[PDB]
């Protein structure tokens, strides 16, 4: 449920293009609102997602305060991330960041992904573009209860989703974040031959090897979330 009446938010300014804008609920929270595309989408797969989310509670995937159904177009009302996307925050921080950091923004997302992969909830998506940068520079992985750059080959020649195809998007994930915001690569088939994607600077021998194990061919030869998780935390400690 969690219905919100249009009365109750404030726009303040469009932040992203639905369309992403900042604003208040109650005059009172800081909200980041999203209004629902009219083309793409409709109407009751978009409030079936927040549904999905206002149900699953983790530090590290994104919060809602409630939707607002009354009139067209109808919006998602979340919890404000002081620093946008992820995509962009380390494109304009680029040459700032430290390799712990960027690891430590890799483990975020690792931790709310293996709760949704222990939850059975496949994200499908999963891009630097579909996180979110909070205070203290935290990671939250939105937009969970719903390419080829981010598609593993089961997903773009089957259409096969699975918690391991998200493994494989998580793998790209980490090359976006090591690489500070780079954009990844018909690119099907010149992954199918040996075509991975070349090792960042910042990204040690280590954490390379992670990225390509997330990149295994067969999805049962990737590791789990879970799994992930202890070998991402254990590059860290060493
Ligand atoms: C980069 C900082 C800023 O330019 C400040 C206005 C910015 C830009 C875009 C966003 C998007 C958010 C945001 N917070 N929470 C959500 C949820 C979103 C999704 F679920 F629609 S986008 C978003 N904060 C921002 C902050």
Not at 113 to 137: K, P, T
Not at 158 to 179: A, C, P, T
Request: glycine share 6%.
């Amino acid at each position: 449920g969690s219905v919100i009446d249009p009365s109750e938010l404030t726009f303040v300014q469009e932040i992203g293009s639905g369309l992403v804008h900042l604003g208040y609920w109650l005059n009172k929270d800081k909200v980041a609102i999203k209004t629902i595309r009219e083309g793409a989408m409709s109407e009751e797969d978009f409030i079936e997602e927040a549904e999905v989310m206002m149900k699953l509670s983790h530090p590290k995937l994104v919060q809602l305060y409630g939707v607002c159904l009354e009139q067209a177009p109808i919006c998602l009302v979340f919890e404000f991330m002081e620093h946008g996307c992820l995509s962009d925050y380390l494109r304009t921080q680029r040459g700032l960041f430290a390799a712990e950091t960027l690891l430590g923004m890799c483990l975020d997302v690792c931790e709310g992904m293996a709760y949704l992969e222990e939850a059975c909830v496949i994200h499908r998506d999963l891009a630097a573009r579909n996180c979110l940068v909070g205070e203290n520079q935290v990671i939250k992985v939105s937009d969970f209860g719903m390419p080829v750059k981010w598609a593993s080959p089961e997903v773009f020649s089957f259409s096969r989703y699975s918690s391991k195809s998200d493994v494989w998007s998580f793998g790209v994930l980490m090359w976006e974040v090591f690489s500070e915001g780079k954009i990844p690569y018909e690119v099907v088939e010149d992954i199918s031959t040996g075509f991975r994607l070349y090792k960042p600077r910042l990204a040690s021998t280590h954490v390379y090897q992670i990225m390509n194990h997330c990149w295994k061919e067969r999805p049962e030869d990737r590791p789990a979330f879970s799994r992930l998780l202890r070998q991402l935390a254990e590059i860290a400690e060493s």
